[PDB]
Coordinates of C-alpha atoms and ligand atoms in Angstrom, one line a residue:
Chain A
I1 CA -83.4 -58.2 64.9
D2 CA -87.0 -57.7 63.7
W3 CA -85.5 -54.8 61.7
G4 CA -88.5 -53.5 59.7
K5 CA -91.5 -55.5 60.9
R6 CA -92.9 -53.8 64.0
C7 CA -95.5 -51.0 63.6
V8 CA -95.7 -47.3 64.2
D9 CA -98.5 -47.6 66.7
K10 CA -95.8 -48.8 69.2
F11 CA -94.7 -45.2 69.1
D12 CA -96.6 -42.0 70.1
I13 CA -96.0 -39.1 67.8
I14 CA -95.6 -35.8 69.6
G15 CA -95.3 -33.5 66.7
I16 CA -93.4 -32.6 63.6
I17 CA -89.8 -31.4 64.2
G18 CA -88.9 -30.7 60.6
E19 CA -88.4 -31.9 57.0
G20 CA -85.7 -34.2 55.7
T21 CA -84.3 -35.3 52.4
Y22 CA -86.9 -38.0 51.7
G23 CA -89.9 -37.1 53.9
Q24 CA -91.1 -35.5 57.2
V25 CA -89.4 -36.1 60.5
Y26 CA -91.3 -36.6 63.8
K27 CA -90.6 -36.4 67.5
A28 CA -92.2 -39.5 69.0
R29 CA -92.6 -41.3 72.3
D30 CA -92.0 -45.0 72.7
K31 CA -94.9 -46.7 74.5
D32 CA -92.8 -49.3 76.3
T33 CA -89.0 -48.4 76.6
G34 CA -89.5 -45.0 78.2
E35 CA -86.9 -43.5 75.8
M36 CA -87.6 -40.7 73.3
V37 CA -87.0 -41.1 69.5
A38 CA -87.1 -39.1 66.2
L39 CA -88.8 -40.8 63.2
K40 CA -87.6 -40.0 59.7
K41 CA -90.6 -41.0 57.5
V42 CA -89.9 -42.6 54.1
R43 CA -92.7 -42.3 51.6
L44 CA -92.4 -44.7 48.7
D45 CA -94.0 -44.5 45.1
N46 CA -94.4 -40.7 45.4
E47 CA -91.2 -41.1 43.4
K48 CA -91.8 -43.7 40.6
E49 CA -88.5 -45.4 41.6
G50 CA -89.8 -46.8 45.0
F51 CA -87.8 -46.9 48.1
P52 CA -85.5 -43.8 47.7
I53 CA -81.8 -44.5 47.2
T54 CA -81.0 -41.7 49.6
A55 CA -82.5 -43.7 52.5
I56 CA -80.8 -46.9 51.3
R57 CA -77.4 -45.2 51.5
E58 CA -78.1 -43.7 54.9
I59 CA -79.4 -47.1 56.2
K60 CA -76.5 -49.0 54.7
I61 CA -73.9 -46.6 56.3
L62 CA -75.5 -46.2 59.7
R63 CA -75.5 -50.0 60.3
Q64 CA -71.7 -50.1 60.1
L65 CA -71.1 -47.1 62.3
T66 CA -71.8 -47.4 66.1
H67 CA -70.2 -44.8 68.4
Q68 CA -71.2 -42.7 71.4
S69 CA -70.7 -39.5 69.3
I70 CA -72.6 -40.8 66.2
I71 CA -76.4 -40.5 65.8
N72 CA -77.9 -43.8 66.8
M73 CA -80.4 -45.4 64.4
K74 CA -82.3 -47.9 66.6
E75 CA -84.5 -49.7 64.1
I76 CA -86.9 -49.3 61.2
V77 CA -90.6 -49.6 61.7
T78 CA -93.6 -49.7 59.2
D79 CA -97.2 -48.5 59.1
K80 CA -98.2 -52.3 58.8
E81 CA -101.3 -54.1 57.4
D82 CA -99.9 -53.7 53.8
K83 CA -99.7 -55.7 49.2
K84 CA -101.1 -52.1 49.7
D85 CA -98.8 -49.3 48.7
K86 CA -100.2 -47.3 51.7
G87 CA -97.6 -48.6 54.1
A88 CA -94.6 -46.3 54.7
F89 CA -91.3 -46.8 56.5
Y90 CA -89.8 -44.9 59.4
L91 CA -86.2 -44.7 60.5
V92 CA -85.9 -44.7 64.3
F93 CA -83.2 -42.4 65.8
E94 CA -82.5 -41.6 69.4
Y95 CA -84.0 -38.2 70.1
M96 CA -81.5 -35.2 70.4
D97 CA -82.6 -31.9 72.0
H98 CA -80.7 -29.3 70.0
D99 CA -78.6 -28.6 67.0
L100 CA -75.5 -26.4 67.3
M101 CA -76.9 -23.8 64.8
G102 CA -80.2 -23.4 66.6
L103 CA -78.4 -23.2 69.9
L104 CA -76.1 -20.4 68.8
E105 CA -78.7 -18.3 67.0
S106 CA -81.0 -18.3 70.0
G107 CA -78.6 -15.8 71.6
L108 CA -79.4 -17.5 75.0
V109 CA -76.4 -19.7 75.7
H110 CA -72.7 -18.8 76.1
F111 CA -70.0 -21.5 75.7
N112 CA -66.8 -20.9 77.7
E113 CA -63.5 -22.6 76.9
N114 CA -64.2 -25.8 78.9
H115 CA -67.6 -26.2 77.0
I116 CA -65.8 -26.1 73.7
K117 CA -63.1 -28.5 75.0
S118 CA -65.7 -31.2 75.7
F119 CA -67.7 -30.6 72.4
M120 CA -64.6 -30.8 70.2
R121 CA -63.3 -33.8 72.1
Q122 CA -66.6 -35.7 71.4
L123 CA -66.8 -34.4 67.8
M124 CA -63.2 -35.4 66.9
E125 CA -63.6 -38.7 68.6
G126 CA -66.7 -39.5 66.6
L127 CA -65.1 -38.3 63.3
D128 CA -61.9 -40.3 64.0
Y129 CA -64.1 -43.4 64.3
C130 CA -65.6 -42.6 60.9
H131 CA -62.2 -42.0 59.4
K132 CA -60.6 -45.2 60.8
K133 CA -63.4 -46.9 59.1
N134 CA -63.3 -45.8 55.5
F135 CA -66.1 -43.2 55.5
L136 CA -66.3 -39.5 54.6
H137 CA -69.1 -37.4 56.0
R138 CA -69.1 -34.6 53.5
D139 CA -71.9 -32.7 55.2
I140 CA -70.5 -31.5 58.6
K141 CA -72.0 -28.2 59.6
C142 CA -73.5 -26.5 62.7
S143 CA -77.0 -27.8 61.8
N144 CA -75.8 -31.4 61.6
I145 CA -74.1 -31.4 65.1
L146 CA -76.8 -32.6 67.6
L147 CA -76.7 -32.0 71.3
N148 CA -78.9 -33.3 74.1
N149 CA -79.5 -32.0 77.7
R150 CA -77.0 -34.4 79.3
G151 CA -74.2 -32.6 77.4
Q152 CA -73.5 -35.3 74.8
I153 CA -72.4 -34.3 71.3
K154 CA -73.5 -36.6 68.4
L155 CA -72.8 -36.4 64.7
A156 CA -75.8 -36.8 62.3
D157 CA -77.0 -36.6 58.7
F158 CA -75.0 -39.4 57.0
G159 CA -77.1 -39.2 53.9
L160 CA -74.2 -37.7 51.9
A161 CA -71.6 -39.9 53.3
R162 CA -69.7 -42.4 51.2
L163 CA -66.9 -45.0 51.5
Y164 CA -63.4 -43.9 50.4
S165 CA -60.2 -46.0 49.8
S166 CA -57.0 -44.5 51.3
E167 CA -54.6 -42.7 49.0
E168 CA -56.3 -44.7 46.2
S169 CA -57.0 -43.3 42.7
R170 CA -60.8 -43.1 42.5
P171 CA -62.9 -40.0 41.8
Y172 CA -65.9 -38.5 43.7
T173 CA -68.6 -35.8 43.6
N174 CA -67.2 -32.3 43.7
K175 CA -69.9 -30.1 45.3
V176 CA -70.4 -32.0 48.6
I177 CA -70.2 -29.7 51.6
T178 CA -72.3 -26.6 52.1
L179 CA -70.5 -23.4 50.9
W180 CA -69.7 -21.9 54.3
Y181 CA -68.0 -25.1 55.5
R182 CA -66.4 -26.2 52.2
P183 CA -62.6 -26.5 52.1
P184 CA -60.5 -24.7 49.5
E185 CA -59.6 -27.8 47.5
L186 CA -63.2 -28.5 46.7
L187 CA -63.8 -24.8 45.7
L188 CA -60.9 -25.3 43.3
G189 CA -62.4 -28.5 41.8
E190 CA -60.6 -31.4 43.5
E191 CA -62.5 -34.6 42.8
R192 CA -60.2 -37.2 44.3
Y193 CA -60.2 -35.8 47.9
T194 CA -59.6 -37.1 51.4
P195 CA -60.9 -37.1 54.9
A196 CA -59.3 -33.6 55.3
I197 CA -62.5 -32.2 53.9
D198 CA -64.3 -33.2 57.1
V199 CA -61.5 -31.8 59.3
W200 CA -61.8 -28.4 57.6
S201 CA -65.5 -28.4 58.3
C202 CA -64.8 -29.1 62.0
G203 CA -62.3 -26.3 62.0
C204 CA -65.1 -24.0 60.9
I205 CA -67.2 -25.3 63.7
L206 CA -64.4 -24.6 66.3
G207 CA -64.0 -21.0 65.3
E208 CA -67.7 -20.5 65.1
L209 CA -68.0 -21.6 68.8
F210 CA -65.7 -18.7 70.0
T211 CA -67.3 -16.2 67.7
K212 CA -71.1 -16.2 67.4
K213 CA -71.2 -16.2 63.5
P214 CA -69.9 -18.5 60.8
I215 CA -66.4 -17.5 60.0
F216 CA -66.6 -17.7 56.1
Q217 CA -70.0 -16.3 54.9
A218 CA -70.3 -15.9 51.2
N219 CA -73.0 -16.9 48.7
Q220 CA -70.8 -17.9 45.7
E221 CA -67.7 -20.0 45.2
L222 CA -65.6 -17.1 43.9
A223 CA -66.5 -14.8 46.9
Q224 CA -66.2 -17.8 49.3
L225 CA -62.6 -18.5 48.2
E226 CA -61.9 -14.7 48.6
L227 CA -63.0 -14.6 52.2
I228 CA -61.0 -17.8 53.0
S229 CA -57.9 -16.3 51.4
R230 CA -58.4 -12.9 53.2
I231 CA -57.9 -14.8 56.5
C232 CA -56.1 -18.1 55.8
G233 CA -53.8 -16.7 53.0
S234 CA -54.1 -17.0 49.3
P235 CA -53.5 -20.5 47.7
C236 CA -50.0 -20.8 46.3
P237 CA -47.4 -23.5 45.9
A238 CA -45.3 -22.1 48.7
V239 CA -47.8 -23.4 51.3
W240 CA -49.7 -25.8 49.1
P241 CA -47.5 -27.2 46.2
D242 CA -50.3 -29.1 44.4
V243 CA -52.6 -26.1 43.8
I244 CA -51.2 -26.0 40.3
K245 CA -52.7 -29.5 39.7
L246 CA -56.3 -28.3 40.6
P247 CA -58.9 -27.7 37.9
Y248 CA -59.8 -24.1 38.7
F249 CA -56.6 -22.8 40.3
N250 CA -55.8 -20.4 37.4
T251 CA -59.3 -19.2 36.5
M252 CA -60.5 -18.3 40.0
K253 CA -58.2 -16.6 42.5
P254 CA -58.4 -13.6 44.8
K255 CA -57.4 -10.2 43.5
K256 CA -54.6 -9.8 46.0
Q257 CA -52.0 -12.4 47.2
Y258 CA -52.9 -12.4 50.9
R259 CA -50.7 -13.3 53.9
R260 CA -52.1 -15.6 56.6
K261 CA -53.7 -13.4 59.2
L262 CA -55.5 -16.2 61.0
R263 CA -53.8 -15.6 64.4
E264 CA -54.4 -11.8 64.2
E265 CA -58.0 -12.1 62.9
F266 CA -58.8 -14.5 65.9
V267 CA -56.3 -13.2 68.4
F268 CA -59.1 -13.3 71.1
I269 CA -59.0 -17.1 71.0
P270 CA -56.9 -18.9 73.8
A271 CA -53.5 -20.1 72.7
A272 CA -54.1 -23.9 72.8
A273 CA -57.4 -23.6 71.0
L274 CA -56.0 -21.2 68.4
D275 CA -53.2 -23.8 67.8
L276 CA -55.8 -26.5 67.0
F277 CA -57.8 -23.9 65.0
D278 CA -54.7 -23.0 62.9
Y279 CA -53.9 -26.7 62.4
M280 CA -57.4 -27.5 61.1
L281 CA -57.6 -24.6 58.6
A282 CA -54.4 -25.5 56.7
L283 CA -55.0 -24.8 53.0
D284 CA -53.0 -27.9 51.9
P285 CA -55.1 -31.0 52.7
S286 CA -51.9 -33.0 53.3
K287 CA -50.8 -30.4 56.0
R288 CA -54.3 -30.5 57.6
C289 CA -54.3 -32.5 60.9
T290 CA -56.2 -35.8 61.0
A291 CA -58.9 -36.5 63.6
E292 CA -56.3 -38.7 65.3
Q293 CA -53.7 -35.9 65.5
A294 CA -56.4 -33.4 66.7
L295 CA -57.2 -35.7 69.6
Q296 CA -53.5 -35.7 70.5
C297 CA -53.1 -31.9 70.5
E298 CA -52.6 -29.7 73.6
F299 CA -56.2 -28.5 73.6
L300 CA -58.0 -31.9 73.6
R301 CA -55.4 -34.4 74.9
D302 CA -56.4 -34.5 78.5
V303 CA -60.2 -33.8 78.1
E304 CA -62.5 -36.5 79.5
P305 CA -66.0 -35.2 78.7
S306 CA -67.7 -37.7 81.1
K307 CA -66.1 -35.7 84.0
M308 CA -67.2 -32.2 83.1
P309 CA -70.5 -30.5 84.1
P310 CA -72.4 -29.8 80.8
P311 CA -73.4 -26.3 79.9
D312 CA -77.1 -25.5 80.6
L313 CA -79.1 -24.9 77.4
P314 CA -82.8 -24.1 76.7
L315 CA -84.7 -27.3 77.6
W316 CA -85.9 -27.2 74.0
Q317 CA -84.8 -25.5 70.7
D318 CA -86.1 -22.1 69.7
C319 CA -84.0 -19.9 67.4
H320 CA -86.1 -16.9 68.6
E321 CA -85.8 -15.4 65.1
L322 CA -87.4 -12.0 64.8
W323 CA -90.4 -11.9 62.5
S324 CA -88.9 -11.5 59.1
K325 CA -90.2 -12.3 55.6
Chain B
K1 CA -76.5 -58.8 62.9
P2 CA -78.9 -61.5 61.5
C3 CA -77.9 -65.1 60.7
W4 CA -78.1 -66.0 57.0
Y5 CA -76.9 -69.6 56.9
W6 CA -78.9 -72.8 57.0
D7 CA -77.8 -76.5 57.2
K8 CA -78.8 -79.2 54.8
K9 CA -81.7 -80.3 57.0
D10 CA -83.3 -76.8 57.3
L11 CA -83.0 -76.4 53.5
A12 CA -85.2 -79.5 53.2
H13 CA -88.1 -77.6 55.0
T14 CA -88.3 -74.3 53.1
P15 CA -91.8 -72.7 52.9
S16 CA -92.1 -74.0 49.4
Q17 CA -91.6 -77.6 50.4
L18 CA -94.0 -77.2 53.3
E19 CA -96.6 -76.3 50.7
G20 CA -96.0 -79.5 48.7
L21 CA -93.4 -78.4 46.2
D22 CA -90.9 -81.2 45.5
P23 CA -87.1 -80.6 46.0
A24 CA -86.4 -81.0 42.3
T25 CA -89.0 -78.4 41.3
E26 CA -87.7 -75.9 43.9
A27 CA -84.1 -76.4 42.7
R28 CA -85.3 -75.8 39.2
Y29 CA -87.2 -72.7 40.2
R30 CA -84.1 -71.4 41.9
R31 CA -81.9 -72.1 38.9
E32 CA -84.3 -70.3 36.5
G33 CA -84.8 -67.4 38.9
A34 CA -81.0 -66.9 39.3
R35 CA -80.4 -67.2 35.6
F36 CA -83.3 -64.8 34.9
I37 CA -81.7 -62.2 37.2
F38 CA -78.3 -62.9 35.5
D39 CA -79.6 -62.5 31.9
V40 CA -81.7 -59.4 32.6
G41 CA -78.9 -57.6 34.5
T42 CA -76.4 -58.7 31.8
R43 CA -78.5 -57.1 29.1
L44 CA -78.6 -53.9 31.1
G45 CA -74.8 -53.9 31.6
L46 CA -74.7 -54.4 35.3
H47 CA -71.8 -55.2 37.6
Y48 CA -71.2 -58.9 38.5
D49 CA -71.4 -57.8 42.2
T50 CA -74.9 -56.3 41.4
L51 CA -76.0 -59.5 39.8
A52 CA -74.7 -61.5 42.8
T53 CA -76.4 -59.2 45.3
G54 CA -79.8 -59.5 43.6
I55 CA -79.4 -63.3 43.5
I56 CA -78.6 -63.5 47.2
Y57 CA -81.7 -61.4 47.9
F58 CA -83.6 -63.9 45.8
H59 CA -82.4 -67.0 47.6
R60 CA -82.9 -65.5 51.1
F61 CA -86.4 -64.4 50.1
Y62 CA -87.5 -68.0 49.5
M63 CA -86.4 -69.1 53.0
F64 CA -89.3 -67.1 54.3
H65 CA -91.8 -67.3 51.4
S66 CA -93.2 -70.0 49.2
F67 CA -92.8 -70.2 45.4
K68 CA -96.5 -71.2 45.2
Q69 CA -97.5 -67.8 46.7
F70 CA -94.8 -65.6 44.9
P71 CA -94.0 -66.0 41.2
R72 CA -90.3 -66.3 40.8
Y73 CA -89.6 -63.9 37.9
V74 CA -91.5 -61.1 39.6
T75 CA -89.3 -61.6 42.7
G76 CA -86.2 -61.8 40.6
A77 CA -86.9 -58.5 38.9
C78 CA -87.6 -57.0 42.3
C79 CA -84.3 -58.2 43.8
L80 CA -82.3 -56.9 40.8
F81 CA -84.1 -53.5 41.2
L82 CA -83.2 -53.2 44.8
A83 CA -79.6 -54.5 44.2
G84 CA -78.8 -51.8 41.7
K85 CA -79.8 -49.2 44.3
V86 CA -77.7 -50.9 47.0
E87 CA -74.7 -51.4 44.7
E88 CA -74.8 -47.8 43.5
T89 CA -75.7 -48.8 39.9
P90 CA -79.3 -47.6 39.8
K91 CA -81.6 -48.7 37.0
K92 CA -85.1 -47.4 36.4
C93 CA -87.8 -50.0 37.0
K94 CA -89.3 -49.4 33.6
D95 CA -86.0 -50.7 32.1
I96 CA -86.2 -54.0 34.1
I97 CA -89.7 -54.8 33.0
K98 CA -88.8 -53.9 29.4
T99 CA -85.8 -56.2 29.5
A100 CA -87.8 -58.9 31.3
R101 CA -90.5 -58.6 28.6
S102 CA -87.8 -59.1 25.9
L103 CA -86.6 -62.5 27.2
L104 CA -89.8 -64.1 28.5
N105 CA -92.7 -65.5 26.6
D106 CA -96.2 -64.5 27.5
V107 CA -96.8 -67.5 29.7
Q108 CA -93.8 -66.6 31.8
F109 CA -94.4 -62.9 31.6
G110 CA -98.0 -63.6 32.7
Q111 CA -96.6 -63.7 36.3
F112 CA -96.5 -59.9 36.1
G113 CA -100.3 -59.9 35.7
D114 CA -102.1 -57.1 33.8
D115 CA -99.8 -54.3 35.0
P116 CA -96.2 -55.5 35.3
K117 CA -94.6 -52.5 36.9
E118 CA -96.7 -52.2 40.1
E119 CA -96.1 -55.9 40.9
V120 CA -92.4 -55.1 41.4
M121 CA -92.9 -51.9 43.3
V122 CA -95.3 -53.2 45.9
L123 CA -93.1 -56.3 46.4
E124 CA -90.0 -54.1 47.2
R125 CA -91.6 -53.3 50.7
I126 CA -92.0 -57.1 51.4
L127 CA -88.4 -57.9 50.2
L128 CA -86.9 -55.2 52.5
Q129 CA -88.7 -56.5 55.5
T130 CA -87.8 -60.1 54.7
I131 CA -84.1 -59.4 54.4
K132 CA -84.4 -57.3 57.6
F133 CA -82.8 -54.2 55.9
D134 CA -79.5 -56.1 55.9
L135 CA -78.5 -54.8 52.6
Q136 CA -74.7 -55.1 52.6
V137 CA -73.6 -58.4 51.1
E138 CA -70.1 -59.8 50.1
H139 CA -69.5 -62.4 47.5
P140 CA -66.9 -65.1 46.7
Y141 CA -65.3 -63.1 43.9
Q142 CA -63.2 -60.7 46.0
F143 CA -61.9 -63.6 48.1
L144 CA -61.0 -65.7 45.0
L145 CA -58.9 -62.8 43.8
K146 CA -57.4 -62.2 47.2
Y147 CA -56.5 -65.8 47.8
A148 CA -55.2 -66.4 44.3
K149 CA -52.8 -63.4 44.7
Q150 CA -50.9 -65.3 47.3
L151 CA -50.1 -68.3 45.0
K152 CA -46.7 -68.3 43.2
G153 CA -46.5 -71.8 41.5
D154 CA -46.8 -70.7 37.8
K155 CA -48.4 -67.6 36.1
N156 CA -50.3 -69.3 33.3
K157 CA -51.6 -72.1 35.5
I158 CA -52.8 -69.7 38.2
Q159 CA -54.8 -67.6 35.7
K160 CA -56.4 -70.8 34.2
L161 CA -57.4 -71.8 37.8
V162 CA -58.8 -68.3 38.6
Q163 CA -60.8 -68.3 35.3
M164 CA -62.3 -71.7 35.9
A165 CA -63.0 -70.8 39.6
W166 CA -64.7 -67.6 38.5
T167 CA -67.1 -69.6 36.2
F168 CA -67.8 -72.0 39.1
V169 CA -68.7 -69.0 41.3
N170 CA -71.3 -67.9 38.7
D171 CA -72.7 -71.5 38.6
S172 CA -72.8 -71.5 42.5
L173 CA -75.3 -68.6 42.4
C174 CA -77.8 -71.0 40.8
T175 CA -77.8 -73.2 44.0
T176 CA -78.3 -72.5 47.7
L177 CA -74.6 -72.6 48.4
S178 CA -74.7 -69.0 49.4
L179 CA -77.3 -70.0 52.0
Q180 CA -75.0 -72.8 53.4
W181 CA -71.4 -71.4 53.5
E182 CA -69.7 -68.1 53.9
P183 CA -68.4 -66.5 50.7
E184 CA -64.8 -67.1 51.8
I185 CA -65.5 -70.9 51.9
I186 CA -67.2 -70.8 48.5
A187 CA -64.0 -69.1 47.2
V188 CA -61.8 -71.9 48.5
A189 CA -64.2 -74.5 47.2
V190 CA -64.1 -73.4 43.6
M191 CA -60.3 -73.2 43.6
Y192 CA -60.3 -76.8 45.0
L193 CA -62.7 -78.0 42.2
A194 CA -60.8 -76.1 39.5
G195 CA -57.6 -77.7 40.8
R196 CA -59.1 -81.1 40.5
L197 CA -60.5 -80.6 37.0
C198 CA -57.1 -79.1 35.8
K199 CA -55.1 -81.8 37.7
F200 CA -53.0 -78.9 39.0
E201 CA -51.7 -79.5 42.5
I202 CA -52.4 -76.3 44.4
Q203 CA -50.2 -77.2 47.4
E204 CA -47.1 -76.7 45.3
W205 CA -48.0 -73.0 45.0
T206 CA -48.2 -72.2 48.7
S207 CA -45.5 -71.0 51.2
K208 CA -46.1 -74.4 52.8
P209 CA -45.7 -76.5 49.6
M210 CA -45.3 -79.7 51.7
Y211 CA -48.9 -79.6 53.1
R212 CA -52.1 -80.6 51.2
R213 CA -54.2 -78.4 53.6
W214 CA -53.3 -75.5 51.4
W215 CA -56.5 -73.7 52.2
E216 CA -56.1 -73.5 56.0
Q217 CA -53.9 -70.5 55.3
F218 CA -57.0 -68.6 54.1
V219 CA -59.9 -70.1 56.1
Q220 CA -59.8 -71.6 59.6
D221 CA -60.9 -75.2 60.4
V222 CA -62.6 -76.0 57.1
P223 CA -62.5 -79.8 56.7
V224 CA -62.1 -81.4 53.2
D225 CA -65.6 -83.0 53.5
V226 CA -67.2 -79.5 53.4
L227 CA -65.3 -78.7 50.2
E228 CA -66.1 -82.0 48.6
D229 CA -69.8 -81.4 49.3
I230 CA -69.7 -78.0 47.6
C231 CA -68.0 -79.6 44.6
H232 CA -70.8 -82.3 44.5
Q233 CA -73.5 -79.6 44.5
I234 CA -71.7 -77.6 41.7
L235 CA -71.0 -80.6 39.5
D236 CA -74.7 -81.5 40.0
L237 CA -75.4 -78.5 37.7
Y238 CA -73.4 -80.2 35.0
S239 CA -75.7 -83.3 35.1
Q240 CA -76.2 -82.3 31.5
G241 CA -73.5 -79.6 30.7
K242 CA -69.7 -80.3 30.2
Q243 CA -67.6 -79.4 33.2
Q244 CA -65.6 -76.2 32.8
Ligands
5I1_1 C1 -84.1 -19.9 61.8 N1 -83.5 -21.1 62.3 C2 -82.7 -21.8 61.3 C3 -84.5 -22.0 62.9 C4 -85.5 -21.3 63.8 C5 -86.7 -22.1 64.1 C6 -86.5 -23.2 65.0 O1 -86.5 -23.0 66.2 N2 -86.3 -24.4 64.5 C7 -86.4 -25.7 65.1 C8 -85.6 -26.8 64.6 C9 -85.7 -28.0 65.2 C10 -86.4 -28.2 66.4 C11 -86.4 -29.5 67.0 O2 -87.5 -30.0 67.4 N3 -85.3 -30.1 67.3 C12 -84.0 -29.4 67.0 C13 -83.2 -30.2 66.0 C14 -82.9 -31.6 66.5 C15 -84.3 -32.3 66.8 N4 -84.1 -33.6 67.3 C16 -83.5 -34.6 66.6 N5 -83.1 -35.7 67.2 C17 -82.5 -36.7 66.4 C18 -82.4 -36.5 65.0 CL1 -81.7 -37.8 64.1 C19 -82.9 -35.3 64.5 C20 -82.8 -35.1 63.0 C21 -82.0 -35.7 62.1 N6 -82.2 -35.2 60.9 C22 -83.2 -34.2 61.0 C23 -83.7 -33.4 60.0 C24 -84.7 -32.4 60.4 C25 -85.1 -32.3 61.7 C26 -84.5 -33.1 62.7 C27 -83.6 -34.1 62.3 N7 -83.4 -34.4 65.2 C28 -85.1 -31.5 67.8 C29 -87.1 -27.1 66.9 C30 -87.1 -25.9 66.3

């Protein structure tokens, strides 16, 4: 073990990679192992409640999840030579080279069908592992899907994850997923939801790999449900009997009653992928495929990612965003 | 995954005893520390799982640190503070010190020094390193309920057995039993003791009524001598109190 005791000097910081939910995040070089890591820094006492509960939850969850497609937290180190509130903690993760959002907005890489086959296979395998354990991610999006240069997909950002009991009657937090990846039952106020919320988010990822943009881009819940209905069909009991049991079904709805145009709006997508795509964007959560069923579908069944040449990406991440204020 | 279980010989060489503290005084310090966590968290309306998690942090802490170097009530307040955050029942640290101030006299509250709050905050870093960030803990309560659900001898006598076994689990937290045996074994042991004190015969209620080894259906290869020793440690807490 030694989880928590060794010091930060045993790592060489290379630079700041970004900002997290409870402190800065550093790219760092291990002195000895020869492997690269990312360090999520945890300052304490800046908040008068000490070690942040957001880290506790992420630490507690990541120790029970170990999978090739899940972000790997290796250990926790400290500044050392503490008494002395100066000492801070650092969560050690294996370094990943890109996130899907930065990879797509660079405009520099093109994913063909086989590339998306391998990515979704790894993503659905990792999510199935989380769903056979009793964990919901509740924050899947393009920026939380990490990718290295060996072509390996890994799921990250488990801070918002929580344990669920199957078909049990216990309530949760309603506004969990970012708006562009939030399923319709959450937009209508479902609070006792299911792992289908993660599958919807992955369905948005799949369509966003064939198109270059997110498929549902709105800035408010009312408009977001409108764009979803314009493509996936309006929520109604014919396709989704339980919409009448949802808190906001009557007070927020599209102007028109839309018919499902998903196969015509995305006709350029190959048939097998469009079949999985249609399966993942079912309005009714009970009709939405599970991660297990998604692995058994035509598009992903025979995919062995370890036997496919990875697509070549920029050796580092750079969104190449035009100067804009 | 770390290892969190000691034998009777290793518990006789804790850091406190190495510094000259007698076994009786450390056992008393552990009782008062566990009961302190219990009373403070009770007055704040905390889950019994949260109380048990703070107490388990407290017992493991003093397998690596000495009571002569770390005052017990400061450590207890720190363990309850971390446990509430782990068990998703957060409580502001200001509240724990306030509640601790309400139950302790000035000589006991003197352990918090001039500024009581900072003593708990700076200790949280030490506690986390000591428990090796192994935050998830399970307790005998869930197994007592799970094992009792599979008894069918008599409804009223089962509930009396569960109720006495639940009380014995609370008493167990005042000892190092959680450092000796897995929570499943503690669950079986308190049913065994409750069955003795009630003169109920638990074997009658199993699917194998003819078979005294009624517990080998729940835990594998647990000899009766282990259960007898757990009972002896628990009844030791009743050296003064009436058993029940
Ligand atoms: C306008 N658009 C949006 C951006 C343009 C500007 C632009 O180019 N940005 C930009 C963003 C990131 C990087 C970057 O250095 N990386 C890419 C991302 C994965 C990094 N490796 C990485 N590996 C493991 C983990 Cl757990 C995390 C991790 C877990 N949680 C985290 C929270 C925050 C940061 C990292 C993590 N991050 C590397 C470089 C440039």
